[PDB]
Design a protein. Structure first.
Ligand SMILES: *[C@@H]1O[C@H](CO)[C@@H](O[C@@H]2O[C@H](CO)[C@@H](O[C@@H]3O[C@H](CO[C@H]4O[C@H](CO[C@H]5O[C@H](CO)[C@@H](O)[C@H](O)[C@@H]5O)[C@@H](O)[C@H](O[C@H]5O[C@H](CO)[C@@H](O)[C@H](O)[C@@H]5O)[C@@H]4O)[C@@H](O)[C@H](O[C@H]4O[C@H](CO)[C@@H](O)[C@H](O)[C@@H]4O[C@H]4O[C@H](CO)[C@@H](O)[C@H](O)[C@@H]4O)[C@@H]3O)[C@H](O)[C@H]2NC(C)=O)[C@H](O)[C@H]1NC(C)=O
Ligand SMILES: *[C@@H]1O[C@H](CO)[C@@H](O[C@@H]2O[C@H](CO)[C@@H](O[C@@H]3O[C@H](CO[C@H]4O[C@H](CO)[C@@H](O)[C@H](O)[C@@H]4O)[C@@H](O)[C@H](O[C@H]4O[C@H](CO)[C@@H](O)[C@H](O)[C@@H]4O[C@H]4O[C@H](CO)[C@@H](O)[C@H](O)[C@@H]4O)[C@@H]3O)[C@H](O)[C@H]2NC(C)=O)[C@H](O)[C@H]1NC(C)=O
Ligand SMILES: *[C@@H]1O[C@H](CO)[C@@H](O[C@@H]2O[C@H](CO)[C@@H](O[C@@H]3O[C@H](CO[C@H]4O[C@H](CO)[C@@H](O)[C@H](O)[C@@H]4O)[C@@H](O)[C@H](O[C@H]4O[C@H](CO)[C@@H](O)[C@H](O)[C@@H]4O)[C@@H]3O)[C@H](O)[C@H]2NC(C)=O)[C@H](O)[C@H]1NC(C)=O
Ligand SMILES: *[C@@H]1O[C@H](CO)[C@@H](O[C@@H]2O[C@H](CO)[C@@H](O[C@@H]3O[C@H](CO)[C@@H](O)[C@H](O)[C@@H]3O)[C@H](O)[C@H]2NC(C)=O)[C@H](O)[C@H]1NC(C)=O
Ligand SMILES: *[C@@H]1O[C@H](CO)[C@@H](O[C@@H]2O[C@H](CO)[C@@H](O)[C@H](O)[C@H]2NC(C)=O)[C@H](O)[C@H]1NC(C)=O
Ligand SMILES: *[C@@H]1O[C@H](CO)[C@@H](O)[C@H](O)[C@H]1NC(C)=O
Ligand SMILES: *[C@@H]1O[C@H](CO)[C@@H](O)[C@H](O)[C@H]1NC(C)=O
Ligand SMILES: *[C@@H]1O[C@H](CO)[C@@H](O)[C@H](O)[C@H]1NC(C)=O
Ligand SMILES: *[C@@H]1O[C@H](CO)[C@@H](O)[C@H](O)[C@H]1NC(C)=O
Ligand SMILES: *[C@@H]1O[C@H](CO)[C@@H](O)[C@H](O)[C@H]1NC(C)=O
Ligand SMILES: *[C@@H]1O[C@H](CO)[C@@H](O)[C@H](O)[C@H]1NC(C)=O
Ligand SMILES: *[C@@H]1O[C@H](CO)[C@@H](O)[C@H](O)[C@H]1NC(C)=O
Lengths: 228, 210, 292
């Protein structure tokens, strides 16, 4: 089996150097090609570049003079460096193996062909958000269930700055029926979101619903239990 | 920019991506399940790796003047995801950006009724003695709603904060309406309402103190 | 799309042109080969500007070599040597008389004799003075060597109008892949032919000698390359893969890089430069190498 794990800071100040690491397990980093693909929220994946041993390494012409790749054969991992980051680099960076192919159309001997690359085994991916901010913390309040055989239940993250806030349910043990709404920028300058889950009314249990609210700029981890 | 292709379960789906072919191509297709990572489906125009059923076929990269077409026979509910393409043309430079994806949708969706949900202020906030009515609006298309709060039968002028519609990998748009009140204001009126006007209809849900 | 070793070869030139009327000009573009253009101090020019005039070959006529029988008028006769080993000088034992010779196709080519008469029995070696290294040595083959030449650049003919009346046929865009013309020679056939020729070469330069083959030493393109005509286009092929050997006393095809020139000055003629009009479609031709 081939397992890939991406890992980085998650928050990088503007005009700084983003550093990421792709821990590879199941194969060696010297016998394969390695590519990085980033993807903003709601956009198409953008190829960053591929790295291989013996100096065979190419980058994206648009980010040519800012990206740097490397392979640690001693620690068996892939590294990534992006100097001069901006708000456009906030995306989900994936690390994937790359297999090469040769599309032959001419007579081969006259270089009438071209090599195409394709990623087959991807990783979980890492989230990178670029922001420079002073501080602050959110205030989580439970939304009591109220009403067919179904019922609604959720939480509320009130007054925080800036975006974003990761909200999970039961440490990620409930992904069916979860709808986290985007926050609203109030006139005071603080964001506030909410997250609801459609659950069956048959919840005498007590089937403990504890929402986990995380706000990285303040290291905010709030576990709130919702009870009728 | 975004495109959609709706196909009945069991039929045949066709997906168009990228510009028109100029030379011999090697189109690489990818599938991105909502909330997951893009996975390889078909490389080298119509060569599928191990694990991909033969229902997924791609247009040959030998036809000059046609667009890349991804045919999915026996469409099932599991195929509902995003599909991107990586055009490798012998006449065009290396494309470092995948083509604009196309969303494959399960058969049927003529219009979507907004699913509003009104939550009263929590007791923990009421002990900090702040109040906010929450009106969650989801699963509505198109994204154009107007929220009007009601105190009994009198409209509420100030304190209304409403988000802008935002779709999330579906027809489901998101909209949150907040109404900041005081613990004295909440216990004053008999009940509050959240009238959401979407397209031509207006859904109204109320809330009463205890 | 790259690399830097492709050296362009094809140039996409934009220029003015006189229309039918003698007032407004015409900003049209064409596609010329590097052998046809030359820069001047990117601005280029036709390579034949300060040589002679230029006339475009009419698309109606063709340069296809057709058999032409030469005949003698009344009172004359043509004698024909009908011996199987006539190395071409001196008394002939079996002489016959004819009025008209056989069909001789005027195939204009260099280095490699194409579409010629096959020799009888052993391949023939003819020279005016064998000890003289300044006189050419005409070699005639017994078994023809199959050669295939192709132009993988199926082209477009733009009919730009230099009126009134005249019309120039420029080269439009190329449909498909950017490929260069090439020629195939069957490796086995070339081996047997060369091994059969060196055995005849040892009959005049000593029995136990080494015969080494090298390509041309230099000069013009018409002598250093295999110059010929195919489909209207004028190819100049690299014959460095055929004459690269060393024979002592005792399965695929050899591809050769072929260039294409449109503005030619054959027969070392100055005053008349002919512009070969572009030819639509992939040009394929199969010929016989029958002599050197
Ligand atoms: C003079 O001499 C020279 C030199 O000797 C000769 O040059 C030759 O020129 C011709 C064209 O003039 C070239 O033909 C082209 O060859 C390519 C490459 O073919 C080889 O590779 C194929 C790919 O191999 C990989 O993939 C297969 C399949 O998965 C794997 O199994 C392999 O392990 C490899 O990983 C391979 O498939 C080929 O085998 C098949 O083809 C040959 C030739 O027809 C048959 O003999 C075999 O039995 C077998 O059937 C071969 O090994 C071809 O790919 C080209 O075809 C594509 O392109 C055409 C134009 O673009 C297109 O119209 C076709 O439809 C075909 O496209 C198909 O395939 C694409 C890729 O799979 C798809 O993307 C596409 O959608 C479609 O499905 C073409 O035939 C010769 O390569 C070249 N030879 C050399 C040595 O350079 C010249 O011919 C001589 N004569 C003259 C000048 O007159
Ligand atoms: C040494 O000797 C060999 C032996 O002949 C000789 O080979 C000949 O090569 C030439 C090419 O240079 C050949 O002539 C051309 O052949 C093509 C292809 O032939 C196909 O078509 C016929 C149709 O019945 C088939 O039977 C045949 O088997 C092939 O499938 C033809 O398409 C060409 O036709 C056009 O060109 C002529 C000259 O340009 C025109 O006069 C003729 O009217 C045709 O013109 C019309 O059609 C075109 C088609 O697109 C059109 O575009 C034009 O505008 C026009 O309207 C042509 O006949 C020939 O086939 C070869 N010989 C044999 C036996 O096959 C070598 O050339 C020779 N070497 C030298 C240096 O001389
Ligand atoms: C070498 O480069 C030349 C460049 O000119 C190519 O020539 C062109 O090739 C294309 C593709 O074959 C031709 O397009 C074809 O047009 C047909 C209709 O043309 C007639 O009708 C139009 C009006 O609609 C008139 O204007 C025109 O003058 C004709 O009277 C279509 O029917 C064709 O589609 C059919 O054939 C293709 C395969 O060719 C199939 O895939 C289709 O499914 C369909 O069955 C086609 O679209 C174009 O006409 C050609 N132009 C000229 C001037 O000849 C060569 O094709 C190219 N060759 C190679 C080997 O690369
Ligand atoms: C379009 O242009 C790009 C850019 O030039 C082409 O990519 C180039 O491809 C060549 C051939 O593989 C590369 O040369 C390589 O050099 C290294 C040096 O160590 C050598 O080890 C390799 O064996 C190879 O010769 C070149 O680096 C590469 N350039 C880039 C920027 O990636 C490409 O092939 C062209 N065609 C297509 C379809 O992309
Ligand atoms: C030139 O092209 C012809 C035609 O493709 C070649 O002849 C073919 O040779 C193969 C191998 O012996 C046979 O299987 C085919 O049947 C032949 N076809 C025809 C039409 O003759 C020939 O070998 C080529 N020669 C060179 C030097 O490339
Ligand atoms: C093609 O472009 C390159 C890069 O600018 C240039 O150096 C070269 O002169 C151009 N022409 C040819 C024939 O390569
Ligand atoms: C011709 O070339 C000249 C170069 O000086 C340019 O100014 C002009 O636009 C071109 N076209 C015509 C129609 O004159
Ligand atoms: C060429 O043929 C000769 C004579 O039969 C020989 O010694 C040699 O090995 C052949 N060359 C090749 C490449 O087959
Ligand atoms: C002969 O081959 C050499 C390469 O060794 C090349 O430089 C030269 O141009 C060739 N000459 C001819 C006449 O083909
Ligand atoms: C002819 O081919 C040989 C071998 O590839 C090469 O060294 C030489 O430079 C070529 N000649 C020309 C004029 O390109
Ligand atoms: C000529 O053949 C020899 C022997 O195969 C080879 O070493 C040499 O490179 C060839 N010359 C050219 C110009 O290809
Ligand atoms: C050229 O050689 C081929 C191969 O044997 C033959 O079929 C053809 O008739 C020859 N052409 C002539 C002798 O004109």
């Amino acid at each position: 089996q081939v397992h890939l794990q991406e890992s980085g800071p998650g928050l990088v100040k503007p005009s700084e150097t983003l550093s990421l690491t792709c821990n590879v397990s199941g194969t060696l980093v010297r016998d394969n090609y390695w590519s990085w693909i980033r993807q903003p929220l709601g956009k198409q994946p953008e190829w960053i570049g591929y790295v291989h041993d013996s100096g065979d390494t190419n980058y994206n012409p648009s980010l040519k003079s800012r990206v740097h790749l490397s392979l640690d054969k001693s620690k068996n991992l892939v590294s990534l460096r992006l100097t001069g980051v901006t708000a456009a680099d906030s995306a989900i960076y994936y690390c994937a193996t790359t297999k090469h192919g040769r599309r032959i159309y001419g007579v081969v001997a006259f270089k009438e062909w071209f090599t195409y690359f394709y990623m087959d085994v991807w990783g979980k991916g890492t989230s990178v958000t670029v922001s420079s901010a002073s501080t602050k913390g959110p205030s989580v309040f439970p939304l009591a269930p109220s009403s067919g055989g179904t019922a609604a239940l959720g939480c509320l993250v009130k007054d925080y700055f800036p975006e974003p806030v990761t909200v999970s349910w039961n440490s990620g043990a409930l992904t069916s029926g979860v709808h986290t709404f985007p926050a609203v920028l109030q006139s005071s300058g603080l964001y506030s979101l909410s997250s609801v889950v459609t659950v069956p009314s048959s919840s005498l249990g007590t089937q403990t619903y504890i929402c986990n609210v995380n706000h990285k700029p303040s290291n905010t981890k709030v576990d709130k239990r919702v009870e009728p | 920019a975004p495109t959609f292709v709706s196909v009945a379960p069991g039929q045949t789906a066709r997906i168009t991506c990228g510009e028109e072919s100029l030379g011999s191509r090697s189109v690489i297709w990818y599938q991105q399940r909502p909330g997951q990572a893009p996975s390889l489906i078909i490389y080298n125009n119509n060569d599928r790796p191990s694990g991909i059923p033969d229902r997924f076929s791609g247009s040959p990269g030998s036809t000059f003047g046609t667009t890349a077409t991804l045919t999915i026979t026996s469409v099932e509910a599991g195929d509902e995801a995003d599909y991107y393409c990586h055009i490798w043309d012998s006449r065009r430079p290396t494309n470092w950006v995948f083509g604009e994806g196309t969303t494959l949708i399960v058969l049927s969706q003529p219009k979507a009724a907004p699913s509003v949900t009104l939550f009263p202020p929590s007791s923990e906030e009421l002990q900090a003695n702040k109040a906010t009515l929450v009106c969650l609006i989801s699963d509505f298309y198109p994204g154009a709603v107007t929220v009007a709060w009601k105190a009994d039968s009198s409209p509420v002028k100030a304190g209304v904060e409403t988000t802008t519609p935002s779709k999330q990998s579906n027809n489901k748009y998101a909209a949150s309406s907040y109404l900041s009140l005081t613990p004295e204001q909440w216990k004053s009126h008999k009940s509050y309402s959240c009238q959401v006007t979407h397209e031509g209809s207006t859904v109204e849900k109320t809330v009463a103190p205890t | 799309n790259i690399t830097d070793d492709m050296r362009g070869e094809l140039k996409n030139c934009s220029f003015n042109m006189t229309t039918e009327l003698r007032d407004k000009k015409q900003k049209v573009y064409s596609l010329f080969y590097r052998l046809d253009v030359v820069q001047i101090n990117k601005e280029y020019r036709l390579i034949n500007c300060n040589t002679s005039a230029i006339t475009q070959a009419c698309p109606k006529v063709s340069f296809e070599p057709i058999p032409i029988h030469y005949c003698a008028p009344a009172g004359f006769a043509i004698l024909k040597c009908k011996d199987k080993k006539f190395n071409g000088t001196g008394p002939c034992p079996s002489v016959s008389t004819v009025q008209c010779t056989h069909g001789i196709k005027p195939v204009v080519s260099t280095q490699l004799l194409l579409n010629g008469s096959l020799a009888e029995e052993e391949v023939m070696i003819r020279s005016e003075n064998i000890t003289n290294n300044a006189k050419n040595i005409l070699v005639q083959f017994n078994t023809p060597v199959q050669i295939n030449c192709t132009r993988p650049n199926n082209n477009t003919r733009k009919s730009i109008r230099i009126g009134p009346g005249q019309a120039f046929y420029a080269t439009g865009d190329i449909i498909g892949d950017i490929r260069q013309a090439h020629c195939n020679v069957s490796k086995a056939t070339w081996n047997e032919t060369l091994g059969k020729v060196v055995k005849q070469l040892r009959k005049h330069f000593g029995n136990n000698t080494i015969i080494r083959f090298a390509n041309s030493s230099g000069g013009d393109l018409e002598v250093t390359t295999h110059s010929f005509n195919c489909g209207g286009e004028f190819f100049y092929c690299n014959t460095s893969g055929l004459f690269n050997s060393t024979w002592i006393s005792n399965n695929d095809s050899i591809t050769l890089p072929c260039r294409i020139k449109q503005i030619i000055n054959m027969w070392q003629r100055i005053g008349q430069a002919m512009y070969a009009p572009p030819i639509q479609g992939v040009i394929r031709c199969v010929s016989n190498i029958t002599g050197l």
